[PDB]
Amino acid sequence: MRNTIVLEKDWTFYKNPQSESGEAVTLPHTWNAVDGQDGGNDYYRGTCKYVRHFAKPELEKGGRAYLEFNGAAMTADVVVNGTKLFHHEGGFSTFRVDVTEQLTEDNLLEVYVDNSDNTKVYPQKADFTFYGGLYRMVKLVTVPKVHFVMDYAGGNGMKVTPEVTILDAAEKQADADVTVELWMTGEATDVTVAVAGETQTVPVENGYARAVFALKNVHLWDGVDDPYLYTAKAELPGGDVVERTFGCRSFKVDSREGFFLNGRSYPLRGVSRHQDRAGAGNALTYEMHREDMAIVRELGANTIRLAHYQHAQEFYDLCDENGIIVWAEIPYITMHMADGTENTLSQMKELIVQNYHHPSIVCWGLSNEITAASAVNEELLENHRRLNDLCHELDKTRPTVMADVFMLETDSPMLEIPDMNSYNLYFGWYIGELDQNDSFFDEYHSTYPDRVIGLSEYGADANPAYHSANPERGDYTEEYQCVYHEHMAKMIEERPYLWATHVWNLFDFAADGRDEGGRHGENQKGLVTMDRRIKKDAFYVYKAYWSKAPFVHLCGSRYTDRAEDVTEIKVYSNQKKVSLFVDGAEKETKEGARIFRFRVPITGTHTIRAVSGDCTDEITVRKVDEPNPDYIFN
Amino acid sequence: MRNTIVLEKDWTFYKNPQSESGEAVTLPHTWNAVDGQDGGNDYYRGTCKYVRHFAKPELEKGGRAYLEFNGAAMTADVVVNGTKLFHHEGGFSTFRVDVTEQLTEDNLLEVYVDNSDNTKVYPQKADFTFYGGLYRMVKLVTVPKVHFVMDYAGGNGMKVTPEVTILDAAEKQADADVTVELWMTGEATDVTVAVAGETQTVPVENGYARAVFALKNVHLWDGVDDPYLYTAKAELPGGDVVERTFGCRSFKVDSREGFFLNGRSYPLRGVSRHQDRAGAGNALTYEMHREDMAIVRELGANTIRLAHYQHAQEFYDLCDENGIIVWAEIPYITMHMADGTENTLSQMKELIVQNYHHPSIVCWGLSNEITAASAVNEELLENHRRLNDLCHELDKTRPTVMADVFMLETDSPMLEIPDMNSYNLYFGWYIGELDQNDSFFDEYHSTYPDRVIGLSEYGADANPAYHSANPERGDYTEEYQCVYHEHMAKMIEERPYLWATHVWNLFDFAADGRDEGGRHGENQKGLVTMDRRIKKDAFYVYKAYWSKAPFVHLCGSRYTDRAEDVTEIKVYSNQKKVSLFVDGAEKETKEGARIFRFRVPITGTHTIRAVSGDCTDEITVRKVDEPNPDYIF
Ligand SMILES: Cc1cc2nc3c(=O)[nH]c(=O)nc-3n(C[C@H](O)[C@H](O)[C@H](O)COP(=O)(O)O)c2cc1C
Ligand SMILES: Cc1cc2nc3c(=O)[nH]c(=O)nc-3n(C[C@H](O)[C@H](O)[C@H](O)COP(=O)(O)O)c2cc1C
Ligand SMILES: [Ca+2]
Ligand SMILES: [Ca+2]
């Protein structure tokens, strides 16, 4: 009886809302896919208008019709048949609009979508393009007269809470009390709730129902090796149905020993991901989400920081289904603005209500680098206490965290507010030397041994066009990014008290204000390029640390022209032995772990082949008289 | 300094050793690839001759040259430059021949290979074709004067033993003492051993050396999710080098609770596999081994019973590398013969010596269905006790087992000999009803609760060309094989005390005496056809039980013409919900587990689409007036 149709086709988009003619578009859509990815700090920001018609949907007697917007960046006004019905501030979360009373036979839908600079809607100051438009789907949902609530913060009127007790960690034996709370409109009598083959019927009172299932020997959601998911289903006499997937897992974060999953140590070692891509902008299809996740899996990252905003349900689903552990946050970022305080609380409420069921999520992020351009005063601290309190009020099952900028003094009162802290560190890239990452954490953990500390950002830019036999910080070479991550990976491996670490970033991403490292409009800290077509050499150092799929990878497949008489051939591998062949003749076999380095005298054009068991790779190395200038940013 | 050359090309095969002209072949080779797969109980058995030349290889002063045979089925006689040098009985194990003193610049190699019927070399009575020939590679190996022994039972002079102590099962924390024992000739004074990035020099005394490595926090070999492997490497003065991969794992078998790995319950649920394939015979390439394992992995089986003989080193390696737990055995099968007793002990020694290092292997099988055609008497008992004692003498780290024919009474003295037992049961196919599987094991386990019991064979024949809406034991339909395996799967799930279960068989396989189920020369109990091209529908019942890779499978993709007005549509899947679409129209969503059954009215030609999440499958069904007679045996 609950029916959904996608309002995907037959839109007309008006860049100038006042123009007589527009352009045909299909959702998802953004108007900044080109001008937000090419540099110049000039992508178009303002109010634009989407228009489309839709026919009156079939409705039960006293049924309702809702428009569902899953992503309208950043501020949306919904006008139906010339009446304005909704105003939404928050470009990353679902909202819905009851349009029943305005329905005629043919309905005019005008959506004004705004991504302008203002002081009321985060984000406003950040290192990523603020793509405007209807970049996620718009839907028309019809419900019976008695229905699960549709207007509360983009939720679905269901709140499922699995509380897990580990009985035998090694056997994965656990019990679970699963609470299903529901909220309903209309004069309902009772509701039926189905969980794990059991069924209960409970009374509705004041639009609210509750059911607890005491499950024994539940099948744990246990990370990448067994991401088992359950389904909770609630159904009303009149026929309305809602459901959430959920997973059963316990976890804790020990300030000294790190993250624990289901009674066992489970160090979180992964990356971050922005929700855009070359060409498409943030108008991502499902296949694009899946491809991003398939690259996560090949990499073997077991956690993703989904900065800096609520991501698509499809991607959180993918994390659920793949056993990936997620850090989720709101775009409370860089510069505090007093007029945005309510927007921070509104986006946090929608984030938690709409994502509370995802077992992949283990923490709520309050803000990112918020003291990069804010004085630490009572106003700032208050905004953070209110967000912290809201997280704890809505969700007893996850801690709060925030990502701190490296200038924030470690004794600031800011750090005492959330349950955990992670620092964004760029020592050895933006500032100082690589060693300062190690010392920063040794000193924090020595001063504050009872605090949980992590590494929420770290990286260095690499343009796969640039190379050097003597990489150094700032040459933007593929080789220095390897040097940087080789050091960070060892530094992290030495420090099991880091609760989670996240490479910034898995992918290059659009930042229209950047014009650095030979590519206009892109942050090049990705381990993979923005079009997902090139995995940079530094991707494979992490694959060597993380992946269990045997591989060998020769670095320098783009460092072909080499002026030096003896060159380093570097192989990344999760095997323990590698054999190098030069022009078909075996030159040397080394044992080791992860990183294998060979000295090769070169005199002409050579075919270099690396072998370990059944795994092989091959590159060309070509001696030249003078360094190739195309490899040089200078 | 140790060098190996493959003698693969430029052979001449003489099916009649007395005939002046023959057939140029390349190894691997068998002369039975065609006539052992087509029925008639008539493939050629006898002695055949392989001839090749090879150049004298480069040898250090006092170095040695060995011909290495990895598989000569079944009896080989090796003659170099007219001198008879070696006689080997056993078609499934490596042996080596010192040819040093007969070398000249251009060397003649003649190998007589015999797969004849006799009372000396097992196997002689079994349900599989006894392919003859050099069906695995022949190599020329040269070593320095001081070298690890080459002539001890096809081993390489290294015996590596990890003793694992589990410190914390949930954390996978464990220590292991790794003992490396070495045998060598040439009177070197010491040897250097490398294990896990450590090295150690120990003395050589009377051709033997021993080094112990006390590893802490080893990376456990932990089954399919993490088959981590180490290397033991030894190096002599003068340059000779041998090595063995090994894994660190502890395991135990509980008669009530089943198999345990690295401190946790790890029920062994899987398949068997014969080392042959359509067209190639048993002359398999490396890629054929890899494809077989790729199919094991898709299926999700975590154990393989490698019946009925020693398999290729490459395939044992694949099991090591993929975390597959293995049952290994010798072809002491069906019919005891007094003059084959020494051959059972020779093959078992070679099996253990050559495969002791494989962490995948967890038990040694003494015999299969040996009482199918043997009286249980003191002589039969003694042969088994001697095999049992040899396993225990050579290997303190693995239990023995045997596969019992279903006629063998459960109080027989035979059952008291091995450490564990498994029965080959075909209730519901060969005899009796499906329920008798359940009660056979109930009654055994109730009577002997302290004994380890398992299921070493079970299955039903299925010809993918045959189909029926009302399958019956004996119609050979793809659909009855699913009915059979649906029952067996549920029976097995109810009985955690079954230490291991093994579907007979992963693949159809050649049995030249069989003329059954519309295919001559093949046993059709495979879950996959013999050419590896068609996975029968019962394959996907197990994949729904075992695989974690999401999938949806429609049965009946070969059951296309159906006479019924409302036909049954069965989907196998490891998902929780399956939606069926007919001609594009969504028609029904069912929740459930493993097996999803739909009822679909059919009037003409329809397209049936099954969906769950991103997983899709599709078949075509055509309503007909009369049953297609091709679907009927
Ligand atoms: C996932 C989730 C969904 C929720 N859905 C509803 C809902 O539909 N209706 C409701 O009244 N409360 C819902 N709640 C709970 C309220 O947010 C909670 O009681 C809160 O403290 C009420 O605050 P408010 O009434 O000011 O919005 C939900 C909570 C969670 C975690
Ligand atoms: C894997 C493995 C390899 C062995 N290799 C040799 C060897 O090369 N030389 C040797 O004298 N014994 C070797 N042994 C010797 C064992 O002591 C021997 O097989 C058994 O105890 C007695 O052997 P025997 O009766 O043939 O002397 C090996 C044992 C194993 C398990
Ligand atoms: Ca621009
Ligand atoms: Ca034949």
Residue numbers in the entry:
A (entry chain B): 1 to 634
B (entry chain A): 1 to 633
Quote the study that presented this structure, word for word.
Because intestinal β-glucuronidase (GUS) enzymes have been shown to convert a wide range of glucuronidated metabolites to their corresponding aglycones, we hypothesize that gut microbial GUS orthologs would catalyze the conversion of TSC-G to TCS. The human and mouse gut microbiome have been shown to contain hundreds of unique gut microbial GUS enzymes, which exhibit distinct substrate specificities toward varying glucuronides. Previous studies have shown that microbial GUS enzymes can be categorized into seven distinct clades based on active site architecture and/or cofactor binding. Our central finding is that specific gut microbial enzymes, notably, gut microbial GUS proteins of the Loop 1 and FMN-binding clades, mediate the colonic reactivation of TCS from its inactive glucuronide metabolite, and in doing so they drive the gut toxicity of TCS.
In addition to Loop 1 GUS enzymes, our in vitro results with purified enzymes showed that FMN-binding GUS proteins, notably R. hominis 3 (Rh3) GUS, also efficiently process TCS-G. Thus, we determined the crystal structure of Rh3 GUS and refined it to 2.4 Å resolution. The structure reveals a protein dimer with solvent-accessible active sites located ~30 Å from the bound FMN molecules. Using analogous docking and mutagenesis methods to those outlined above, we validated that specific structural motif, including residues F406 and Y430, as well as the C-terminal domain (see the scheme of the C-terminal domain in Supplementary Fig. S10), are critical for processing TCS-G. Again, these mutant proteins exhibited no structural changes when compared to the wild-type protein. F406 is unique to Rh3 GUS compared to another FMN-binding GUS protein, R. hominis 2 (Rh2) GUS, that we show poorly processes TCS-G (see the alignment of Rh3 GUS and Rh2 GUS in Supplementary Fig. S11). Rh3 GUS and Rh2 GUS also vary in their C-terminal regions, as their C-terminal sequences share only 27% sequence identity, likely contributing to their differences in activity. We were surprised to find that GUSi also inhibited, albeit with less potent IC50 values of 3.7–13 µM, the processing of TCS-G by FMN-binding GUS enzymes. To date, no structure of an FMN-binding GUS C-terminal domain has been reported, as they have remained mobile and unresolved in the structures determined thus far.
